[PDB]
Design an enzyme around this catalytic site. Structure first.
Site, short mmCIF file in Angstrom:
data_model
loop_
_atom_site.label_atom_id
_atom_site.label_comp_id
_atom_site.label_asym_id
_atom_site.label_seq_id
_atom_site.Cartn_x
_atom_site.Cartn_y
_atom_site.Cartn_z
N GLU D 155 35.47 65.92 -145.96
CA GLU D 155 36.16 64.71 -145.54
C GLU D 155 37.18 65.15 -144.50
O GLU D 155 36.84 65.98 -143.64
CB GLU D 155 36.73 63.98 -146.74
CG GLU D 155 35.70 63.49 -147.70
CD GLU D 155 34.78 62.50 -147.06
OE1 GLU D 155 35.24 61.74 -146.19
OE2 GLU D 155 33.59 62.48 -147.43
N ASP D 156 38.41 64.66 -144.53
CA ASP D 156 39.40 65.08 -143.55
C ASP D 156 40.30 66.20 -144.04
O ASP D 156 41.20 66.60 -143.31
CB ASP D 156 40.25 63.90 -143.09
CG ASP D 156 39.49 62.94 -142.22
OD1 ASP D 156 38.40 63.31 -141.74
OD2 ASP D 156 39.99 61.81 -141.99
N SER D 157 40.06 66.75 -145.22
CA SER D 157 40.93 67.79 -145.74
C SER D 157 40.88 69.06 -144.90
O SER D 157 40.05 69.22 -144.00
CB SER D 157 40.57 68.17 -147.17
OG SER D 157 40.83 67.10 -148.05
N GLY H 13 44.65 65.35 -141.81
CA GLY H 13 44.06 65.57 -143.11
C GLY H 13 44.98 66.40 -143.97
O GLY H 13 45.81 67.15 -143.47
N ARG H 45 33.99 61.33 -134.49
CA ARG H 45 35.30 61.05 -133.92
C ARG H 45 35.34 61.36 -132.43
O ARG H 45 36.05 60.68 -131.68
CB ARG H 45 36.37 61.83 -134.67
CG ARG H 45 36.62 61.32 -136.07
CD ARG H 45 37.63 62.16 -136.82
NE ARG H 45 37.90 61.63 -138.15
CZ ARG H 45 37.15 61.90 -139.22
NH1 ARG H 45 36.10 62.68 -139.12
NH2 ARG H 45 37.46 61.38 -140.40
#
Ligand SMILES: [Mg+2]
Ligand SMILES: [Zn+2]
Ligand SMILES: [Zn+2]
Lengths: 49, 82, 49, 196, 115, 51, 259, 147, 67, 404, 45
Positions: D155-157, H13, H45
């Site tokens: 994910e965005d981690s 993030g 993105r």
RNA sequence: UAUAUACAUAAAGACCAGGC
């Protein structure tokens, strides 16, 4: 004497107008501080165009 | 209604089996007699889940038909979905 | 901020050079709040005498 | 060129922008006067291209990248990103821990974040010099692998190096400020600072 | 505020056994070792020493979760060779390797200085 | 129709792939406040007198 | 069914650096060696800090941070010291810790740099490393500011906190010209060649070797200045063999207890 | 592992986890990434200027000059960068051969490393965390307090 | 604020190389030649001295609480 | 516990979970679970409601447990499927090329929780024993579960001619008797869609056996990906020096065909399509040309990508990105639209101060001929910003209507 | 009783409860609290 | 010797900024 007008910082009427770097430090102001805000009851207010 | 002419699914809807294993586990959790031999079980939900597969739970389900009548199904007569 | 009308929000060709295209808040305030471009200088005014 | 040589030496020439504007070289042009103007992006468009788009250019822009504000001027290579991605950085560039003002030891402000070890970037827009972002940088350079490693960064981690974090990396300080005001309210009713 | 102590990784508190041996019922001659307060440094050495042993059919480790520190090593050997014997011979063979490497590194140092 | 409730907790989420589908990491300080009333029986009274 | 016998060749040996080449070993044994060069080589580094008077512009635990990271000369007595947790005495003794002292005041108008040379130790053996090349800078002082503190340095290793890593970056490389195909280049011709490459400039890769397995594990081990780089290595092997001799023990007690 | 980091390109993030320098994948030279970000962030993105900053700044750590990112040049190409990067002994696209940190073995696919500029955000996990069991109660509704 | 001891990535000591690095710049070295004289080979260390921002010189302009 | 994220759009956004207590500060949840809640990890938060009695706790357990809610009543598809790296790794794990030695099988098998204890016999017994990814993945597939899907790249000419079942490219997926015989897995098989290899599990086996199905794919293919790794790099956004010439000669050809359509309309030679204003027929013919331009240069860029390209790896398996993001990176970003129309005139009869009044050419009206890699020119940067503002606004406006 | 530091002339003066705040030898109204005597002990972590 | 120190108070509202 009709009243008192809040003064934007580093305008021609502030005490910090025209001061150099050395003097802004003795007065404990940041020389990088852009100015252009007000001090009302200690908070720093910004009139938004 | 009579034991004849009952019109309802013989299977136990997943809503009934959710409230049967809940109500039974709440009884077991207060000193209630256990129908089935328990072996290394200190947890009521596991005991009540075990009574169900053996069809030992002592509860009759009263199903209200939408017209105001009702039917009484014991938890043995119903057929466990899972 | 409430209004769902999208015409005031959209980026307009007249914003070239005097308002930053990218910088803008999000949420209900999208496009209603706008930063200024670097060179842009708002005019202080004068007398047309 | 003679104008640029004088500005290059601007120190101790008492020769500056106002003396540039007063020579008729630069001009302030507001919006509704930009409808009557022809602009050239760069002096390149002024030279003969053998196929004349326009021969009339009446004003040239100083640099094209001055169309960007203060928070969007910190992005390196902003023309290479999808357009919402320069808008999000404008939102997250205002939230970055860094040294906010240099006098912060004197100031008493509720909620003052500050960061031990700021660094000026290694890839830096040429207009950060006028945002004074070398003086008060908010961030640290970091060596960044782009790889799927253990799955924790999905994910965005982000996965981080814990031996780095032990050396002062992104290790910051959070100041919180309280105030309480003694007062005299009722006739007999006084407030006092005292150990109860 | 919930950050675990730094020392919690390599230190055992009261009651934790270092090693825990549990037989594996899926398989004959299969055993499963559980090592508390260790990580890939120790687990990887042993696994790779067990696979040299021709009487070892299976060996492998895993860290169940990275935030809790323990290793779980399954070993399956051939009949009439016990998986506890396999795991001891592994550890004594590394010690007999690393004691040979520390002696050969000391000789190369003295050779290296003024030689 | 809806109202603020007790026995609730809110915090950030981050991935642990080592979990099952139906598990969740709950930190120790969020799991120390939130309590579950448990009825004492002869079965668990050994465990609960220790708790 | 037995351990292989490796060999060592020391190529470069200096005061900052060791390059050795280990042959005839597993990939897993050769790794776990360099993976011990970071964590488990013990070292001495400041831990308990007590700040009496700090007038500096840097707040207390910001200076207590920089002091920890200062390397201390661990060359010998790390063997003698005991971990503070295992040490029986109350608080700190000479056996589990070293005492440091910094009393610094700026009288002059000039800006004074407090340097690690101002740490003063109770024992001649362990000092800051630069004192054994400019000195590490703890903080700067304007006239009138004073920093005095007392700090006890302990024994620990790099798993706890990164300030006990004896080493700077520990290089590791094996199979420099790619025979084994552990890494597959899309275009083999664009990649620079390793320092250790045996190949002429003409051909990009070694040809595929089906039977081979990685050997010749090239290290470069660069000390931080605490431990001379020769004895970062001797302490890693002797410190891995002590963890494997802690298993064979506590495993033997379980097999004998279980059975 | 709750805190929130973001680059200059809009990649934000949290922290997933923290591996010690042991457990991190290292290059041939012993450089281990301070931060590892997921490659799937990039394709939908489409922040490529994030890929060139890691590239432009790896030449600017080596050459000693602070690179020039200003938006409109024509004097800076991905192709004119790479030719400067090939001179310091790196693969010109910035890919670099890594070894697995846990098991020591090489990682088959080459990984793209470079120095990049990250920001730490006002948003931390310690200030967002909350838990409620039978606490204060509102005066009028006799319901739990807000906030 | 002040130059870190211990470069973040590798862990080499850049703490003591700052005041030696300002000397080389005033001797008309280029940052490439300066960082090579200081002996910093890897670009993890070369970004500590190169990207550093020294605010400890600004913060020493303000006067302390105590004379 | 019951576990929530606002807003709760459907009922998969409240699902009962089973606590496991771990350090630090954040709730932690499997990645397949991020599909129902529609939550990515950047600063998100999720509520936690701990049910307080055995009677209400036995409702959650038999109603709302996540393994029960795998299949949604809405679209009668699975909600949760393989997501992110694992769906990229599965594909790379399942190709014919993948041969796992004896040392790397021992680790993978160690993460199978359902593994029955028996090491399967290698696909290649001699000269050296080598397992295959299809051979190990067939231990993951539970029970005897059977499927035929097709891979995304599966060519249409393949099913008709010879080599139906030999499948030269290994596109067609077959699972017979719980064993993966052939084909590559992707979004269309492990993902969420009707009939996927995951949806047949829950239907044929059960909700319990399909819980161990997700946890095996994720653990054994995440701990395999440490061997291959994955990345995106600049080498993967770049084409040949020959492809850069084919992408320009199509643009110059396009911008030259727009000048003819523009010249035809000045002389009035342009005849209106029935039902269309001459402005409506002109705005159509210019959109028919420019779309074919960016549709051609897009497909000319997708032919150039090598098998080793990472973009092609994330697109082909549907893990993330679409085929249209590759086009804009390598080839052309293409026309920028505002309110469904080509960029309007904000000034009087011209788009920006630089352009000449009444310029309908492709550059003046917002067509961006540069790719994100070569970088956008100044004005193309502004028009690209005008087309993106329309995306931000919609997302802010629609949510408040769709919630009312 | 309580020693405070002037924010202008930086001279410690001893001033006690129920007194207006003015430092002798300046007249400046902003006083600071000096620093505590009790032991502070930090980890170098 | 016995016995005891048991919990409540920080209002509410307004606008503003940010988060997903
Ligand atoms: Mg989000
Ligand atoms: Zn370094
Ligand atoms: Zn005074």
């Amino acid at each position: 004497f009709i009243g008192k007008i809040p003064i934007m910082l580093r305008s021609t009427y502030c005490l910090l107008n025209g001061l150099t770097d050395r003097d802004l430090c003795e007065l404990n102001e940041c020389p990088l501080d852009p100015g252009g805000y007000f001090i009302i009851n200690g908070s720093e207010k910004v009139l938004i165009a | 209604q009579a034991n004849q002419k009952r019109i309802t699914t013989p299977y136990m809807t997943k809503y009934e089996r959710a409230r049967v294993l809940g109500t039974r586990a709440l009884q077991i959790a207060m000193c209630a007699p256990v129908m089935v031999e328990l072996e290394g079980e200190t947890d009521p939900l596991l005991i009540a889940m075990k009574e169900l597969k053996a069809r030992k739970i002592p509860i009759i389900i009263r199903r209200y038909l939408p017209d105001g009548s009702y039917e009484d199904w014991g938890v043995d007569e119903l057929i466990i979905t899972d | 901020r409430d209004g769902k009308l999208a015409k005031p929000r959209q980026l307009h060709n007249t914003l070239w050079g005097m308002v930053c295209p990218a910088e803008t808040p999000e949420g209900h305030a999208v496009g209603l709040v706008k930063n200024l471009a670097l060179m842009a200088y708002i005019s202080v005014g004068s007398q047309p005498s | 060129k003679r104008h640029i040589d004088q500005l290059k030496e601007r120190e101790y020439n008492n020769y500056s922008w106002q003396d540039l504007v007063a020579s008729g070289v630069v001009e302030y042009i507001d919006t509704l006067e930009e409808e009557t103007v022809m602009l050239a992006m760069t002096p390149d468009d002024l030279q003969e291209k053998e196929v004349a788009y326009c021969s009339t250019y009446t004003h040239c822009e100083i640099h094209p990248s001055m169309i960007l504000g203060v928070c969007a001027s910190i992005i390196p290579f902003p023309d290479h990103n999808q357009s919402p991605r320069n808008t999000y950085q404008s939102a997250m560039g205002k939230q970055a821990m860094g040294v906010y003002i240099t006098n912060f030891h004197v100031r008493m402000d509720t909620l003052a974040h500050v960061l031990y070890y700021p660094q000026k970037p290694l890839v830096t827009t040429r207009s950060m010099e006028y945002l004074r972002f070398r003086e008060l940088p908010a961030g640290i350079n970091s060596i960044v692998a782009i790889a799927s490693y253990t799955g924790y960064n999905q994910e965005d981690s982000v996965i981080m190096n814990r031996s780095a974090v032990d050396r002062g990396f992104f290790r910051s300080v959070f100041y919180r400020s309280y105030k309480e005001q003694e007062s005299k309210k009722g006739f007999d009713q006084e407030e006092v600072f005292e150990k109860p | 505020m919930n950050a675990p102590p730094a020392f919690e990784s390599f230190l055992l508190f009261e009651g934790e056994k270092k090693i825990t041996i549990n037989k594996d019922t899926k398989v004959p001659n299969a055993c499963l070792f559980t090592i508390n307060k260790e990580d890939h440094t120790l687990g990887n050495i042993i696994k790779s020493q067990l696979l040299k042993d021709p009487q070892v059919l299976f060996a492998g480790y895993k860290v169940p979760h990275p935030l809790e520190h323990k290793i779980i090593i399954r070993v399956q050997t051939t009949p009439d060779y016990s998986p506890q014997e396999a795991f001891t011979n592994a550890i004594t063979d590394l010690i007999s390797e690393l004691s040979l490497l520390e002696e050969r590194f000391r000789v190369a140092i003295k050779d290296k200085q003024e030689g | 129709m809806g109202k603020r409730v007790d026995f609730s907790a809110r915090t950030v989420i981050t991935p642990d792939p080592n979990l099952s589908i139906d598990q969740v990491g709950v930190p120790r300080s969020i799991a120390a406040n939130m309590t579950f009333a448990e009825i004492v029986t002869p079965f668990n009274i050994d465990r609960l007198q220790e708790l | 069914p037995y351990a292989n016998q490796p060999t060592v060749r020391i190529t470069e040996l200096t005061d900052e650096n060791v390059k050795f080449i280990i042959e005839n070993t597993d990939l897993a044994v050769a790794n776990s060696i360099r993976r011990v060069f970071i964590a488990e080589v013990p070292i001495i580094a400041i831990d308990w800090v007590q700040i009496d008077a700090n007038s500096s512009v840097l707040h207390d635990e910001f200076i207590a941070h920089r002091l920890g990271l200062i390397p201390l000369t661990s060359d010998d007595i790390v063997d003698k010291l005991q971990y503070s947790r295992d040490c029986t005495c109350e608080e700190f003794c000479p056996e589990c810790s070293v005492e440091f002292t910094l009393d610094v005041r700026c009288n002059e108008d000039q800006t004074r740099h407090v340097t690690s040379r101002d740490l003063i130790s109770n024992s001649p053996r362990v000092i800051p490393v630069t004192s054994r090349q400019d000195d590490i800078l703890i903080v700067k002082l304007r006239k009138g500011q004073e920093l005095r503190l007392r700090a006890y340095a302990k024994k620990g290793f790099g798993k706890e906190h990164a300030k006990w890593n004896p080493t700077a970056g520990v290089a590791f490389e094996y199979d420099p010209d790619n025979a084994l195909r552990h890494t597959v280049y899309p275009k083999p011709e664009e990649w620079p060649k390793s320092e250790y490459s045996e190949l002429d400039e003409d051909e990009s890769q070694a040809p595929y070797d089906p039977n081979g397995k990685p050997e010749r594990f090239y290290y470069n081990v660069e000390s931080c200045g605490s431990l001379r780089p020769e004895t970062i290595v001797l302490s890693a092997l002797s410190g891995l063999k002590k963890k494997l001799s802690d298993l064979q023990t506590q495993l033997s007690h379980e097999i004998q207890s279980d059975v | 592992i709750g805190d929130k980091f973001a680059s200059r390109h809009g990649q934000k993030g949290t922290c997933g986890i923290q591996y010690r320098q042991e457990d991190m994948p290292f290059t041939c030279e012993g450089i281990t990434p301070d931060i590892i970000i997921n490659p799937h962030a990039i394709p939908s993105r489409m922040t490529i200027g994030h890929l060139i900053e890691c590239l432009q700044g790896k030449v600017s750590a080596n050459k000693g000059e602070i690179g020039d990112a200003t938006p409109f040049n024509d004097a800076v190409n991905v192709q004119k960068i790479s030719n400067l990067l090939s001179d310091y002994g790196y693969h010109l696209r910035g890919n670099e051969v890594l070894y697995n940190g846990f098991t020591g073995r090489k990682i088959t696919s080459q990984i793209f490393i470079g120095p990049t500029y990250y920001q730490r955000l006002k948003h931390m996990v310690d200030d967002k965390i909350h838990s409620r069991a039978r606490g204060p109660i509102q005066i009028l509704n006799r319901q739990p307090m807000e906030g | 604020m002040i130059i870190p001891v211990r470069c973040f990535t590798c862990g080499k000591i850049v703490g003591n190389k700052w005041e030696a690095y300002l000397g080389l710049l005033q001797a008309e070295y280029t940052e490439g030649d300066a960082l090579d004289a200081l002996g910093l080979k890897r670009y993890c260390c070369r970004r500590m001295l190169l990207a550093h921002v020294d605010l400890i010189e600004k913060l020493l302009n303000y006067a302390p609480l105590e004379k | 516990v019951i576990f929530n994220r606002q807003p709760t759009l459907h009922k998969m956004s409240m699902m009962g979970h089973r606590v496991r207590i771990l350090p630090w500060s954040t709730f932690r949840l499997n990645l397949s679970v991020t599909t129902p809640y529609n939550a990515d990890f950047d600063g998100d938060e999720m509520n936690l409601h701990l049910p307080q009695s055995l009677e209400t706790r036995a409702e959650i357990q038999e109603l709302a447990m996540v393994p029960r809610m795998i299949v949604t009543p809405q679209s009668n598809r699975p909600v949760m499927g393989i997501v992110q790296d694992t769906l990229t790794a599965v594909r790379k794990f399942t190709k014919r090329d993948v041969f796992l030695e004896r040392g790397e099988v021992m680790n993978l098998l160690m993460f199978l929780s359902t593994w029955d204890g028996k090491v399967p016999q290698p696909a290649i017994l001699k000269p050296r024993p080598l397992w295959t990814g299809k051979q190990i993945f067939s231990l993951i597939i539970p029970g005897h579960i059977n499927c035929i899907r097709t891979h995304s790249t599966h060519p249409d000419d393949e099913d008709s001619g010879p080599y139906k079942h030999i499948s030269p490219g290994d596109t067609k997926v077959v699972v017979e008797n719980g064993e993966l015989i052939m084909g590559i897995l992707c979004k269309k098989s492990l993902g969420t869609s009707a009939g996927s290899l995951v949806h047949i599990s829950y239907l044929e086996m059960g909700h319990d056996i399909t819980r161990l199905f997700y946890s095996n794919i994720q653990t054994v293919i995440n701990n395999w990906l440490l061997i291959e790794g994955h990345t995106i790099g600049i080498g993967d956004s770049i084409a040949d020096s020959k492809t850069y010439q084919d992408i320009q000669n199509t643009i110059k050809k396009a911008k030259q065909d727009v000048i003819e359509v523009i010249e035809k309309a000045h002389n009035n030679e342009l005849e209106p399509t029935p039902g269309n204003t001459l402005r409506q027929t002109f705005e159509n013919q210019v959109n028919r040309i420019l779309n074919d331009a960016r549709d051609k240069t897009g497909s000319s860029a997708q032919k150039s990508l090598s098998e080793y390209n990472n973009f092609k790896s994330m697109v082909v398996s549907g893990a993330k990105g679409s085929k249209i993001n590759i086009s804009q990176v390598i080839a052309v970003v293409g026309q920028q639209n505002v309110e469904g129309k080509r960029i309007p005139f904000g000034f009087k009869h011209r788009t920006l101060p630089h352009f000449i009044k009444d310029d309908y050419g492709p550059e003046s009206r917002g067509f961006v001929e540069n790719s994100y890699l070569a970088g956008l020119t100044p004005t193309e940067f502004f028009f690209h910003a005008m087309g993106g503002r329309e995306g931000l606004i919609d997302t802010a406006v629609k949510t408040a209507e769709t919630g009312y | 009783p309580m020693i405070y530091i002037c924010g202008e002339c930086h001279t410690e003066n001893e001033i006690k409860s129920r007194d207006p705040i003015r430092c002798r030898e300046c007249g400046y109204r902003i006083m600071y609290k000096k620093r505590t005597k009790r032991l502070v002990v930090f980890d170098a972590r």
